[PDB]
């Protein structure tokens, strides 16, 4: 297959979470949530994430309750069996922009924007692919490329023509921590946030792995000593043969 059909392979960026002992940067996760909420969430759902998931990762209990309480969710029917709405709770999932696929495609010239909850695991490249894609729209497609109508050129996307246009531009978001919201900074934060959304156990998993590595290595060393200790009578055995 041609390189174009594969898509250009994203660079390996030095993410904070790269590194056997490294967690996510939670300040970046919080900023990335804000990019999700203000830019991506217009077209993309994050359906696997509940408000409670943000608590103690990016937000306090009160902030997350406030986000939930601003929305309306379907309640159980009232006593005459008529539909009712309630305010959101921490157990509720973050609601998506569209009621069904047909509505989603109608708003995006036929293309269906995927749910982003697993996108960092569902694409080769992970955070690097998301970062490369969001920052990799050239001003002009390479001479000779004919884009289908409603397609945008992006070399990281296989085949080159993606139905999503460039969306991150310097200062589309105003970060609440005073960080300069440049295209690169926003792409880095939202890629970090999406990686967390795909693998929220990441920080705990790598710490438990460090404990396991240490214990298992010590046990491996001791098991070698013990095996050698027990085998030495066999290894050291000597014979004298006197032919009968």
């Amino acid at each position: 297959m041609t390189a174009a059909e594969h898509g250009l392979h994203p660079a390996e960026y030095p993410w904070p979470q790269n590194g056997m002992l490294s967690t996510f940067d939670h300040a970046s996760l919080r900023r990335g949530y804000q990019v999700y909420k203000e830019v991506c969430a217009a077209c993309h759902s994050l359906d696997r994430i509940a408000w409670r998931n943000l608590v103690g990762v990016t937000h306090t209990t009160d902030e997350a309750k406030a986000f939930a309480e601003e929305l309306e969710y379907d309640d159980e029917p009232d006593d005459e069996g008529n539909p009712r709405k309630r305010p959101g709770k921490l157990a509720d999932y973050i609601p998506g922009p569209y009621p069904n696929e047909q509505a989603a495609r109608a708003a995006n010239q036929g293309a269906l924007p995927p749910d982003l909850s697993l996108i960092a695991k569902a694409r080769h490249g992970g955070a690097d692919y998301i970062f490369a894609l969001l920052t990799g729209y050239p001003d002009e497609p390479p001479a000779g490329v004919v884009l289908a109508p409603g397609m945008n050129y992006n070399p990281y996307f296989p085949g080159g023509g993606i139905g999503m246009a460039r969306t991150l531009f310097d200062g589309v978001v105003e970060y609440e921590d005073g960080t300069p919201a440049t295209t690169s900074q926003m792409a880095k934060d939202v890629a970090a946030f999406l990686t967390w959304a795909a693998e929220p156990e990441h920080d705990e998993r790598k710490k438990l792995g460090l404990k396991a590595i240490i214990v298992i290595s010590a046990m491996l060393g001791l098991s070698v000593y013990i095996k050698k200790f027990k085998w030495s009578p066999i290894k050291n055995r000597k014979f004298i043969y006197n032919p009968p």
């Binding site: 250009l8 390479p142 000779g144 070399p155 690169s184």
Partner: protein, 71 residues
């Protein structure tokens, strides 16, 4: 402004200059070929995707670490 704009420009003029030239030459050829008539009824239409990939791959190798250092 976006730190990447300057880093990418510097890498194209510097360590990735040979690749930049090939991309430039390619675009010149393709544009000129599109200008010529009976291009629409040609068998093979050349693009510059390959050259573009070679250049971008090169820029990324010389920039990725620098860019994340200033974010």
């Amino acid at each position: 402004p976006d730190p990447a704009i300057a880093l990418h420009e510097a890498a194209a003029e510097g360590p990735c200059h040979d690749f930049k030239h090939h991309f430039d030459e390619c675009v010149e050829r393709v544009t000129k070929a599109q200008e010529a008539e009976d291009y629409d009824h040609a068998e093979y239409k050349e693009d510059c995707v390959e050259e573009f990939f070679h250049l971008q791959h090169c820029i990324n190798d010389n920039t990725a670490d620098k860019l994340f250092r200033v974010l």
